[PDB]
Amino acid sequence: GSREEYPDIDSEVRAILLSHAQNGITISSIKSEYRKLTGNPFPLHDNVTDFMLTIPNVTAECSESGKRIFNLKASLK
Amino acid sequence: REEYPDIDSEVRAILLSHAQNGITISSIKSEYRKLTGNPFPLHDNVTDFMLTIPNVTAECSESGKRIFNLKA
């Protein structure tokens, strides 16, 4: 249970997403940006893709070079 | 992919035929069930495996529905 020592993980990750909404972000970037944002190393060591995709309005996919990319879904109106 | 050699082929097929409208995990599992005649090997972290398949996209919807697709 890593939610005990890092309870705000949800809003912190959504925050990084929101900051990267335009172009999307990789995993290693999510981590470095998490460190920059909170002063603490990204706590999640297992199943990060699953964690990312537990968050609504998120899409993921790979570039041709094999980078797994996450981004917010465009709004529909 | 290791123990199950043809898993790649089978999941690629389930995608090709049944994912045209997007496909959830459990749909992949029941489709695999109706395909190979046996329960889908993976339980946890299927999203990771799916994403390792070329030309596949994942999405968590506004309402929290996890759906997989082929790009175009």
How many domains, chain A? 1
Chain A residue with the nearest C-alpha to that of B70: A61
Tell me which method was used to determine the 3D structure: X-ray
Question: What is the domain range of residue B66?
Answer: 1-72
- Quick check: A59 contacting B, CB < 8 Å? yes
Q: What is the distance of C-alpha B51 from the center of its chain?
A: 9
Distances A25 to A7, A20, A69, B22, B65 between C-alpha atoms, Å = 22, 6, 6, 23, 21
Resolution (A): 2.5
The string of DSSP letters for B26-64 reads HHHHHHHHHHHSS--S--S-HHHHHHTSTTEEEEE-TT-
Cβ neighbours around B28 below 10 Å, total:
22
Torsion angles phi and psi, residue A50, rounded to 5: -60, -40
